[PDB]
Amino acid sequence: ETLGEKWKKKLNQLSRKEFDLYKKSGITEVDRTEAKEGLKRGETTHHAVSRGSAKLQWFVERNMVIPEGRVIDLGCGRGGWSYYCAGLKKVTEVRGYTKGGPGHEEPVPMSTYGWNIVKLMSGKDVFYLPPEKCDTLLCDIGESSPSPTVEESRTIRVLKMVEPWLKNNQFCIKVLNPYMPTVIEHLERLQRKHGGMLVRNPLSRNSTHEMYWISNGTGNIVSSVNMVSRLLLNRFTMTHRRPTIEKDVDLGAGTR
Numbered sequence: 001e002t003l004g005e006k007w008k009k010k011l012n013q014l015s016r017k018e019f020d021l022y023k024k025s026g027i028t029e030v031d032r033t034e035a036k037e038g039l040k041r042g043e044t045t046h047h048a049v050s051r052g053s054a055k056l057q058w059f060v061e062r063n064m065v066i067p068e069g070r071v072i073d074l075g076c077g078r079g080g081w082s083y084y085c086a087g088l089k090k091v092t093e094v095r096g097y098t099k100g101g102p103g104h105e106e107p108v109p110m111s112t113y114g115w116n117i118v119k120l121m122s123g124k125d126v127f128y129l130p131p132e133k134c135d136t137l138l139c140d141i142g143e144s145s146p147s148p149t150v151e152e153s154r155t156i157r158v159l160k161m162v163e164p165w166l167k168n169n170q171f172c173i174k175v176l177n178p179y180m181p182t183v184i185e186h187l188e189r190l191q192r193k194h195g196g197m198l199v200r201n202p203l204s205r206n207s208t209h210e211m212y213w214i215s216n217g218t219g220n221i222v223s224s225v226n227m228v229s230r231l232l233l234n235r236f237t238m239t240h241r242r243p244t245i246e247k248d249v250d251l252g253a254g255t256r
């Protein structure tokens with residue numbers, strides 16, 4: 001049994017009270033107060049529509065993925081990754097696809113900087129989408145489940161779906177459950193072919209073992225995964241730590 005499986009078993013034993021205290025213990029998070037107030041009022045400038053804009057910004061500002069040209073955003077949801085990319089100097093077009101409907105977030109129309117180069121299409125299940133040419137491939141799909149075998153299936157399906165979209169382009173892909181041995185086998189094969197590295201984002205919650213496969217980096221995937229399992233396991237043992245609060249992103253206004 002992997003360390004990740006030990007973490008998942010312990011996570012599943014927590015009461016709701018224990019789970020709520022654990023899920024943000026020692027994590028980093030942006031203060032969404034201003035954005036949530038503005039969005040409730042229907043404000044369309046400055047605000048990021050979700051925590052995802054800051055989450056992708058964390059990788060971009062570290063050069064782990066450098067969006068450029070035509071960006072595809074799979075599983076765009078409200079559009080946080082797409083609206084953030086729309087303001088980036090090298091980006092020329094953003095196309096987001098998301099399922100929408102019951103149980104799924106719908107794109108939020110916004111007027112943040114570069115809105116005019118964004119097209120968010122809902123009602124689209126990416127598992128039936130044929131691949132398109134793009135310079136940047138983003139994917140943030142992977143629904144958590146108390147079952148790690150359900151998560152394993154979900155993760156392998158995303159990895160198989162994204163591959164034909166990868167053609168010597170920039171990429172950032174969520175890996176929901178990176179610790180199951182079958183997933184590690186696929187990730188090692190994918191890294192041999194397309195390069196990149198698996199990275200844990202400090203803005204992820206402790207309630208998920210997600211890591212992101214980014215294009216600009218190198219390293220040992222197994223080492224990186226076990227490092228996260230040990231980190232998350234130890235966070236159960238530690239006294240509660242309020243999250244490290246950071247300022248949310250201002251996505252401005254205007255067209256380009």
Ligand SMILES: C[S@@+](CC[C@H](N)C(=O)[O-])C[C@H]1O[C@@H](n2cnc3c(N)ncnc32)[C@H](O)[C@@H]1O
Binds near residue numbers: 049050053127142
């Ligand atoms: C983690 S959220 C993405 C958040 C987004 N990156 C942001 O910044 O707002 C993942 C999204 O994937 C969508 N999704 C899940 N399965 C999907 C599928 N089969 N096809 C398309 N979208 C899907 C979900 O509805 C959800 O909105």
Ligand SMILES: O=C(O)c1ccc2c(c1)CCO2
Binds near residue numbers: 026231234235
């Ligand atoms: O959970 C952590 O992020 C963490 C990092 C370093 C460290 C600890 C926790 C306890 C002693 O050293």
Ligand code: NA
Binds near residue numbers: 103104105
């Ligand atoms: Na929803």
